[model samples]
Target: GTAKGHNPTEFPTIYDASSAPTAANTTVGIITIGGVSQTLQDLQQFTSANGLASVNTQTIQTGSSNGDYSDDQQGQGEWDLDSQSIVGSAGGAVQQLLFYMADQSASGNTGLTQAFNQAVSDNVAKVINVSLGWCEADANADGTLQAEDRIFATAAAQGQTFSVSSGDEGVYECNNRGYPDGSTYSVSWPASSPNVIAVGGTTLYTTSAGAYSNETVWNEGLDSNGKLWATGGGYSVYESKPSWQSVVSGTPGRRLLPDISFDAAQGTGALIYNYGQLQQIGGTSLASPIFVGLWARLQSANSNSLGFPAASFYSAISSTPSLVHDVKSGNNGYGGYGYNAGTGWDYPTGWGSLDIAKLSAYIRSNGF
Candidate 1:
């Protein structure tokens, strides 16, 4: 059998959030589709139990309020994972969280767009987290790829930063979607959007003192049925390469992802409360919010808007050596469209995970 999940407390220890800038007075927006109802209570309990009492939370209902807590295992569970990951990784420093709930039925690209727009218009949160995404093939066919790119462009202009989960489908991003065998060489949508930071997954190891030890690309590989469970990545078919991404020598002319990574392997998944029960969850979903928590800290330290961090992050990678943990091992693919984690930037791990203390200092001094 698989091992139990890691305690949420381990994150603050390993990531050394206390050594980095704190998220005091920082507010973040979590845009989740498919709606949620019972997450607030669990979130409260999680924050309280984790000594994160200062973190305030609120949920906004939009689109069809039809979905409820009991809708399905996937709906509320997803929200619980998103909220707890962000709050937990903040290490009790986040000031507020605005949950932008959207209707699952009509909430495709449009619902996500509306949620992002609301957050930007209100200016309540400078950083946004999206743990949900679709296969790029479908988005391309349905025109959602371009639509979300436009929306993300607006977010960038408004000085709002967004981070999206690359996905858990491995290199076969289109797998398990009612296809013949869920096999396809594609990336996930919104993550492929050039305007947002695409978050990937890793297997994290830490010392008993909670100090960082090592991380590798997360890849569960193919099951008996040929379904893949790993981090999603590759060049985008829709988005053109941004100027900031040019620094990564082998980067595709089209957008390449993910921009960063976090601990997301299930055996080492972060502890979370799902429907009042403790569950350990892992995925790029977990990675996205964890990064957001760090972003909140960055925003708090800078005391100025960080906007879309893609350009700034790439710039820092080129100049500073300590700002990141360049993961140079592991592979995300069993056999298909995945890539290996190598020195510097690659598809599976990108520029690797963050060293928040170093990153905080770099951004605060550079202000990019």
Candidate 2:
């Protein structure tokens, strides 16, 4: 096994963001549905220890905020994973972060939409990262799926981009529920939202020099807790196919999920500090913020905000093969609802992951 806290370099190298220029004063926003109590000290310490660039942070709390900020066990581990993924693993592309912390109550779950609204109102960060989502069925039941889509649409119009995790429930998207007798396939919301960029997961294999060796759809069958684990991807039951995705070989009439992916397998996870300790973690949660940071870097380099990356991304992959790392192997079908990774744009991984350095140069050259 490799040493702990080595994911910063590994991810940056594999994505080709290593040794490239990092921007200063670029702020990224994170929408946390449950609230995080992590202090600035720990984040600073984490970055310092890992030799990453120092980052400044600000938290905007919506509604009530009550949680043990210092105890890792109090809230879910998502907050820690999101912050570290962008700040520590962006290869210094991110310099400032704004966390929109909201509370999810039993009576109602408006925190997610509230936080997104706040982010848009603040209009501070160009890129916002969301690492939480539910199955399409659940979201549709509560009308959350459509509500957030409206917010994201507004954000896109305002030149703000969002990167959302597809989910960690494998192809079933049922959270280990497994397919029932005659259940139809499912996909995660927010990721399936047409306006936001859906970030999927991958298992990265890198050389000692940190160059890309190979990668596949990230899927690890069952964890110690008997939870089925895999990258969430499938055809959307709600969203119609966007214009940008229609040109792909296997384009579906409905919105196909996971426009892009990144290293997120638990076996090839990230090392971060949580609850006063170091831990290795992985999920599509980690993948979203990493791409957010990369987007921030591109915006900073281009001196312009990239509203929605879908159009640019699809065009780039079609014309320039070097701009992306195409994953042509692996499958994310656990309980039977997912698709396989193909040479180009499969369900498990949309257009595969990216080579950020090359992509940046290409965007600049094409003036996208």
Candidate 3:
């Protein structure tokens, strides 16, 4: 319906406008890229009963290491570029970045994790990003996370850290989506994995000066009839406590989801070029990688000591003077808990939006 005669994604009726957060980097090794598109490809686009119904089976990496195929999209190319630009422009180093375009006509019976691991071995990469996540129930029952977790855990043990998006469905994701067949405290798989940093979303406001001004939790979920609002934070039935989330989850009765957050509001969205078009997109999906790449800049200093940037971020914000802009307003649309970016930490917008100048200094001085 556009004047240009190209079909564009339909916009929902309502939206809360906000800006995407920027990052200051160090560096991250072994950047692994996988998601729905890759999984679909790995499975050869086969349908029910007749197919393997999984990407676990080792499949061939369909993407190329260099040239045109290097930058692909499953709805993340533009954001990835932005994050990459932030790092590259900042003088943060980039090691190995892999692109895995799975063969859609193949069977997912092979070890998916092993396939990625093999790719890492073959390429000598360090960090990987498995952005696609099923409901936690879909994971363990089908070996989704179990398989992928093994791959990431193996990498971590060998000095690689992984990250995943926690999901945008808020508290009702696992329930409404009918993964485990009931509404339970579910985040997303992979993010639920202790080895991974479950990146959540926030709406950031920046002043004319380009410094962070405000933030809000990013949790837009529709109701029974499909209405959206903020409601992302909740307990995760799949994962226990990661050492990184300790300060946030004191006793750990519930797996407090979303170790940290970054700006990801689409209302006052970002301009991203992807799929051969300029799209203004929004979603916590973009948050994880931006965090990964930006934090990658810090790998230089925090190398071995670094795990997930959440907890360490909390420490940094507290001790480092002003590494972030504290958010104090807005709350998620559920549980009457309005999210706040306070003096210290809050679930909605953890440690607050990234302060490039402050973060750069902190990373340089602190090291990883």
Candidate 4:
């Protein structure tokens, strides 16, 4: 029995142990907190598929799912918490960490903001990942940044790097560009927030075992203009280009979008075994987590690099190719060649994907 609206009508065992996505789930399980249960069992099955060792989840807290993102799978608890605990238990070692999501808000964003700040205080977090973006840039600039956007900015000034999703729309969000008819225009809100790291999507392709990889600007489909438009990589008509992105040449006179890039795309998504079945789900949603986990490991390995993960990360990558895998392909907008990943930092791939083992070594070598 499939969930609904899925092809094959019934459901597909979307989980593929051999794939990077499934392997990720299993690898983390080995050192997770809660040792056993339905969730653990699922992890085990995934592990078997991936040939990973059995995990002991005794220290990890597995939360019950209460119906949220993908149906009401009780086994999937707070993904944020799960990642946090795993990173923590390995050693009380971690720097800055944060997670973002749309908490059922219509226009304002108070609920998630308060809760997120509290989480930082409670967990002593450092880097934050915002998987959600706003639909409009606050033109008023009276600091009317949404409640959530405000929260991110405050934290970033204090040295925290809040990574936000650029958006699913092109330069103009859905609410913009109606041509005076009052239609949706401009890109998302928090993405327009100056203090935050507006992370854009990228279409990633990897060789078997992920030996070599490739990326392109994010594009879900073509628009009516027959132009190559992507989800959120462009300029923010409302927000001014921040000092951070201003240094980058060719930025639009207004806000330059996607301070960085990560793996995002439907077909290039990671695998997941949840709700008693295997599935393939991709989006900035997963990219944020993947990056979050990498940051955690980096921090755990070197506590000094805890304050601004981006600062340390970018600085470190600037000199070390062994630590980073630079992507070089793809465009994001009208006839836009997909985002390009070259020898160094570009708008599309950002610093590029982390070479886990290599990066871990760099952190250790540099005394980060």
TM accuracy, model 3: 0.67
| 1-368: candidate 2 lDDT, tens digit per residue | 23222455456676888655564546789887554555455577677877766777887875545532222344446777777777655665476788887656523557667788889888888889998887887888888887878888888888888899998877777543433212346788888888889999988777666567777888887667665577888878878888888768655688888989987887787776776577788889888877877777777777745667788788878778787788888877655545778877887777888888888778777866
TM-score of each: 0.91, 0.91, 0.67, 0.62
Off by over 4 Å in 2: 1-5, 51-53, 64-76, 175-183, 224-226, 335-337
| Candidate 3 per-residue lDDT over residues 153-201, each given as its tens digit | 6656555556566666655456654222223345567667766666666
What are the lDDT figures for the candidates, one per model?
Answer: 0.77, 0.75, 0.47, 0.46
Ten consecutive residues with minimal summed lDDT in candidate 3? 5-14
How many pairs of residues in model 2 come into backbone collision? 1
Q: Candidate 3: global Cα-lDDT?
A: 0.47
Better of 1 and 2 by lDDT: 1
Which digits, one per residue and each the tens of the lDDT, describe model 1 over residues 238-261? Answer: 788999889988656999999999
Is candidate 2 or 4 superior in TM-score?
2
Please estimate how well model 2 matches the true structure, expressed as its whole-model Cα lDDT: 0.75
Residues 79-135 of candidate 4: C-alpha lDDT, one tens digit per residue: 422332233222222222222222333223443444445433333344555555445
Task: Give residue 6's error in model 3 in angstroms.
Answer: 22
Candidate 2 has a TM-score of 0.91
lDDT of 2 at 363: 75
Model 3 RMSD in Å is 10.4
Best-fitting candidate, scored by lDDT: 1
